[PDB]
């Protein structure tokens, strides 16, 4: 009956392009319980307030977590032209969203570090003539089409990953380029929160 954020606290978090998504339905949540286990560096919201999101009822609540570095925090804004918002992660404009940047304290041993931060610097589909490039921009809430060709971690900064597309798919290539950022002393993460609406169930409520 209580919304279970446990998968977040155990194991190695993913990267920004292959972010982990938790969908909560029919449960009670304690957002303060979760945020107190971390060192919150940034907390912003759109079409709602940090206090409101923690005290309302919705049809579902969506939480995205991933390894992200603070240095790169400007790139997470939707007013960036950078690779992150173009090819990795874009939040919903139409629905109320929250973006939390936090740091894993040394006490939180259960969350293990990745070797480094990885992201897609570009994602493109080349046509059958191997010349004409159609950039693949991320839609809000959606994964990059290149998550299927990029490893769960970029092996080395500047790597290119590519796969041929079958004639049924119109042929050509799917090509992506990866970048890395050196790992910080404590793991830095990003959390994305989205809430959805429905007329039947508003069974995602704050625990009282």
């Amino acid at each position: 009956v209580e919304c279970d954020f446990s998968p977040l606290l155990s194991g190695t978090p993913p990267q920004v392009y292959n972010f982990k998504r938790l969908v909560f339905t029919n449960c009670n949540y304690n957002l303060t319980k979760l945020l107190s286990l971390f060192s919150v560096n940034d907390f912003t919201c759109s079409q709602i307030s940090p206090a409101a999101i923690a005290s309302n009822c919705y049809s579902s609540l969506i939480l995205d977590y991933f390894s992200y570095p603070l240095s790169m925090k400007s790139d997470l804004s939707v007013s960036s032209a950078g690779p992150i918002s173009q090819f990795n992660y874009k939040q919903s404009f139409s629905n109320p969203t929250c973006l939390i940047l936090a740091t894993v304290p040394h006490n939180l041993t259960t969350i293990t570090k990745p070797l480094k931060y990885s992201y897609i610097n570009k994602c493109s589909r080349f046509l059958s003539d191997d010349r004409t490039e159609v950039p693949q921009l991320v839609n809000a809430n959606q994964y990059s089409p290149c998550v299927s060709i990029v490893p769960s971690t970029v092996w080395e900064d500047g790597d290119y990953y590519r796969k041929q597309l079958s004639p049924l798919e119109g042929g050509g290539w799917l090509v992506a380029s990866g970048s890395t950022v050196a790992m910080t002393e404590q793991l830095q993460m990003g959390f994305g929160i989205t809430v959805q609406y429905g007329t039947d169930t508003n069974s995602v409520c704050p625990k009282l």
Partner: antibody
Amino acid sequence: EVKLVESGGGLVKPGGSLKLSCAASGFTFSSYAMSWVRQTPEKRLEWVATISSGGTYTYYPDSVKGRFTISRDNAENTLYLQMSSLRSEDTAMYYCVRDGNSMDYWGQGTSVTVSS
Amino acid sequence: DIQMTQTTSSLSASLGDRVTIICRASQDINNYLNWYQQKPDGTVKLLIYYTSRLHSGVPSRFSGSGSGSDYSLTISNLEQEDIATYFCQQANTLPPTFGAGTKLELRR
């Protein structure tokens, strides 16, 4: 046409050393991560090592860490596996593999036997 | 380390049949699952990468489906050349680990 041709396999005594090679062709070798995978006579597959495209990073399982060294020569288009402190459990068919998000292409393998 | 469990080690089927090999991971591996075919002469090829993507040169009758820790490889309209051992492999974390494989036999 992607080609991977391993060589260097043989009989080696326990506690011994052996260096395997892999001749790559038909693709831009320096653009891909490369891996070694071995198959035991009981047909079980086990990953041995991966090296990044530029040679900067290397990764190994615990069963081989400290004993095996993967390396590459991007000018010569060849992958290497230096083995040392060999045990009889290392007896296997060793495959050169093109890596990435998956193991694309596999060589035909080279046989290694560790025995007195 | 993540354990890959291929629940059946040997499978028997007829030509034209639809075969489904199932792979279980000991953990959520976030679709980083690949399939390999090894023919009796030892030759290994990649069939499917990232759960459902078909490697080039591999016939459409090979397909993949799954999520989390439950994954499947399917061969439809079973042909003679499909006599092989099929391995799954997780590529989510290191070390990448393989299943013990599933041997496919044809009925006669």
